[PDB]
């Protein structure tokens, strides 16, 4: 009661201290400084490859390190590995549980991870003397549905769940070595830093927390949205990230300075964002919507540099290769397209 | 085409075989009947290993040469809005209820009632942007408890604006009308109502008839005669 009230007052005082310490540094805005630069031309990209073979909705995809192989997960209980240069199929892995929501591809190329709605993350081994693909081990311990997973190394993986918690795992043993707590709502996505020493995560409470892999202690918290956060990704520099929410708005955040940078909104679009991705040079920002179309934004001028319309259903996943050559789009019409 | 080497031809053959296996596996999965099962809790959802049997829980069974897959999603304890679209293509959502325990006003919250919540859930499920054109089949309860509970306690008057009292037929018909008059479509979605009995066979024939009727209606709407 009284102790609770005084603790709440102390927390509000700390919040005021944060609020008026953040506001001292906000001197200028990005747009008025960037207005000197010359705007990028109207980017128009064409469809080069059309990948077919799925029989249900496509929920996730991931690019390989060599930027020629990619894995896609779909609700018909299948996991297909593609050759993007010749449209051939390399592998097709049946799943024990049909419902999946995310997939990952190992940076070395030996393992593929999947999972969702069954609270179990499974690991598959691609290179066996047996000549098949077999599950290496199944990770258990989460309570809510799995929403994202990323291979930190060949023996480590970090996952986010619907139980409001993110956990790091040891693949060799199968036990959680670090647990991250603090999100009030459901965690929906995460992205790893290029140095694999930090990562972020977007939760349903319209906040994104910057974690620390080693010591397992949260460092910074970012706000500014008004609804659920569905997508997140790092800038190639490693000092900024962009978030996508369901309020038809994309925002850019800075790590070194705790301030808002940009807003990507248009009165013509009032639909939610499903996926967010960057480019090799960090110039143009790509975001998929549920209005059946994708959109290409200039990261420096917040203007639509082009459109990308080839799907008749909702776009669910996006991806850009490591060399920046191409870009892939997956949708609910069970078709994958490669644009250039 | 003819410019391929000896390796790429075998790669193409492998890809073609993978395609044919995928297609033949996906053909069989289209003739399965998927059922999504919902309930208020102890309203009889656990009564499956006896009635129809000799994370997300899934059970498989067959009847009169027809494959069934029932998904129990009542143990997820997560936000429904984030994963309810995963069942967009299901057939004949089943909404098991137990409203024979109405006069026993309990909520585990000290303020509400089982009946009111149950109707809130029924209205919430039936009127999504999804689940349109998806029929609902209702299982009410074992009627003996209602029989023995309405006779001793005329507590049914706790429901505002009711005329009759202490008549099982009238009260049951009133409750059924109350649920069946809650859907906001009433023109493109059908609701089937049944009363469960101890008999083991009587609880499966109804489901089989309802699903075959739904399939026939879907075929009529698909072949252009509708």
């Amino acid at each position, epitope marked *: 009661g009284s102790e609770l009230d005084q603790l709440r007052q102390e927390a509000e005082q700390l919040k005021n201290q944060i609020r008026d310490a953040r506001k001292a540094c906000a001197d200028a805005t990005l747009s008025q400084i960037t207005n000197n630069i010359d705007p990028v031309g109207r980017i128009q990209m064409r469809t080069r490859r059309t990948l077919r073979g799925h029989l249900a909705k496509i929920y996730a995809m991931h690019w390989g390190t060599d930027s020629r192989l990619l894995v896609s997960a779909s609700q018909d209980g299948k996991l297909i590995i593609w050759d993007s240069y010749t449209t051939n199929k390399v592998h097709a892995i049946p799943l024990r549980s049909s419902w999946v929501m995310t997939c990952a591809y190992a940076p070395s190329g030996n393992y593929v991870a999947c999972g969702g709605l069954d609270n179990i993350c499974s690991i598959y081994n691609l290179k066996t*003397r047996e*000549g098949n693909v077999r599950v290496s081990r199944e990770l258990a311990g989460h309570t809510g549905y799995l929403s994202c997973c990323r291979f930190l190394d060949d023996n480590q993986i970090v996952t986010s769940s619907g139980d409001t918690t993110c956990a790091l795992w040891d693949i060799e043993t199968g036990q959680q070595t670090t647990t991250f707590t603090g999100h009030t709502g459901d965690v929906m996505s995460l992205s790893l830093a290029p140095d694999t020493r930090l990562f972020v995560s977007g939760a349903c409470d319209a906040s994104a927390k910057l974690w620390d892999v080693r010591e397992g202690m949260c460092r910074q918290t970012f706000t500014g949205h008004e609804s659920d956060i569905n997508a997140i990704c790092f800038f190639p520099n490693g000092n900024a990230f962009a978030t996508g929410s369901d309020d038809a708005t994309c925002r850019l955040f800075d790590l070194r300075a705790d301030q808002e940078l940009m807003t990507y909104s248009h009165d013509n679009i009032i639909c939610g964002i499903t996926s967010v991705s960057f480019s090799k040079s960090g110039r143009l920002l790509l975001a998929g919507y549920d209005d059946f179309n994708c959109n290409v934004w200039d990261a420096l001028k917040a203007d639509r540099a082009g459109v990308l319309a080839g799907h008749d259903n909702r776009v669910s996943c996006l991806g850009v290769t490591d060399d920046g050559m191409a870009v892939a789009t997956g949708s609910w019409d069970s078709f994958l397209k490669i644009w250039n | 085409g003819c410019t391929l*080497s*000896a390796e790429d031809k075998a790669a193409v053959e492998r890809s073609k075989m993978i395609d044919r296996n995928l297609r033949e596996d996906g053909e069989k999965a289209a003739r399965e009947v998927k059922l999504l099962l919902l309930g208020a809790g102890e309203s009889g959802k656990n009564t499956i290993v006896k009635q129809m049997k000799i994370g997300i829980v899934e059970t498989h069974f067959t009847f009169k040469d027809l494959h069934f897959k029932m998904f129990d999603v009542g143990a997820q304890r997560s936000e429904r809005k984030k994963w309810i679209h995963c069942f967009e293509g299901v057939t004949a959502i089943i909404f098991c209820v137990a409203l024979s325990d109405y006069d026993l006003v309990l909520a585990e919250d000290e303020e509400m009632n089982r009946m009111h919540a149950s109707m809130k859930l029924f209205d919430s499920i039936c009127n999504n942007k999804w689940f349109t054109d998806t029929s609902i089949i209702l299982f009410l309860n074992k009627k003996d408890l209602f029989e023995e509970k309405i006779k001793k306690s005329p507590l049914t008057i706790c429901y505002p604006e009711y005329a009759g009292s202490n008549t099982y037929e009238e009260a049951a018909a009133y409750i059924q009308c109350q649920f069946e008059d809650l859907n906001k479509r009433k023109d493109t979605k059908e609701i089937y109502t049944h009363f469960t009995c101890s008999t083991d066979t009587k609880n499966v024939q109804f489901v089989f008839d309802a699903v075959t009727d739904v399939i026939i209606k879907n075929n009529l709407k698909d072949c252009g005669l509708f």
Partner: single-chain antibody
Amino acid sequence: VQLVESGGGLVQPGGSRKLSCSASGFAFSSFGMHWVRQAPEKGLEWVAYISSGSGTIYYADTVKGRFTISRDDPKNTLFLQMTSLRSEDTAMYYCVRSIYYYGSSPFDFWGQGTTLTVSSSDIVMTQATSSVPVTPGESVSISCRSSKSLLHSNGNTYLYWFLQRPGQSPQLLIYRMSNLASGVPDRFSGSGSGTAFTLTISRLEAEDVGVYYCMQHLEYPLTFGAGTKLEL
């Protein structure tokens, strides 16, 4: 993984048998199979190949229209049937296992093999050296040459290096002349450009003595190479 052949023995010119091969320890029905001739005190020679799912069967012109190769998937057995046998059919028959997709390594497992004695344009098969007196503790360079460039516009060169040791079956060393096989020591390395090829062994020890072969996979009439026998 294991591969045991059956049906050997001694035959006559007016004779016919049905070789057998049993595969255990791996998914048999998702692999291509080969047969390789190997005459006594002579080099290797490709014979036949059946694809996965029996979708494709190729033969050699030397024995075209004379041998039949079949596949038995549920019982995991393979057969080769012979109608007429000349004097030049005495050899050391082997069964080879290969799988083709992006990044795979065919001809990885050569099987134990079996023996059978019979009673008495194409790419060229050429190598410069025939024998090399070597002493452990230094480097060895082996060369192999062809008549046509093995390089495609996509960028793959199909040259396979592998070794045979006395008293046991050959095993793969290098595939596509750039990559080491699984479980092969890093001492070996391969390189080339166009038609010129070389194979270097950084450190030599007592277990690296035997006969070396070079093979091209550019066209389906697979031609082996001469042997470069190394003597301790």
